[PDB]
Structure formats: structure tokens, C-alpha cells
User: Which sequence fits this backbone?
């Protein structure tokens, strides 16, 4: 908000599969 | 001519003399092999609404 009053909204979705043998 | 020659240093206050010799030999060997396999993945659904 100043003295126009800029607004933002964010989403991140981060799956990360893994395997090791 | 008999071998009863105990005219000097009669130590038969028992006087037990011991010996204990001891040797030892020892080798060893190893073979240690590993092998890894691994893979990954992800996803990065992001957003922003200014």
C-alpha cells in the first residue's frame, strides 16, 4: 500500500519423487 | 663310573624353572564392492497473481 495499493498472490506445487537401490 | 655327581650346587629347594615360547602368524584379506543406482524427478507448478 502506498500513500495504487498493489496486491499479489502466488502458489507453487512441487512434488519430487526419488528412489535409490 | 656312575652319574650321581651331586657334590656341588644341590638346589632341591624345589626351584621349578619354566619356559614358554610362543610364535604366531596371521594374514587377512578383504574385498568390499558396493554399487549405487538412484534417480529422481519433480514438478514445479508455480503461480503468482500480481
Assistant:
Amino acid at each position: 500500500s502506498t500513500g495504487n495499493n498493489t496486491i499479489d498472490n502466488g502458489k507453487t506445487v512441487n512434488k519430487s519423487s526419488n528412489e535409490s537401490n | 663310573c656312575i652319574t650321581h655327581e651331586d657334590y656341588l650346587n644341590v638346589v632341591y629347594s624345589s626351584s621349578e624353572v619354566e619356559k614358554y615360547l610362543q610364535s604366531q602368524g596371521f594374514t587377512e584379506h578383504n574385498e568390499d564392492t558396493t554399487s549405487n543406482t538412484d534417480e529422481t524427478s519433480n514438478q514445479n507448478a508455480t503461480s503468482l497473481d500480481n
Remarks:
- Residues 3 and 10 of chain B are 14 Å apart (CA to CA).
- The interface with chain A takes residues 36-50 of chain B (CB under 8 Å).
- Chain B has no helices and two strands.
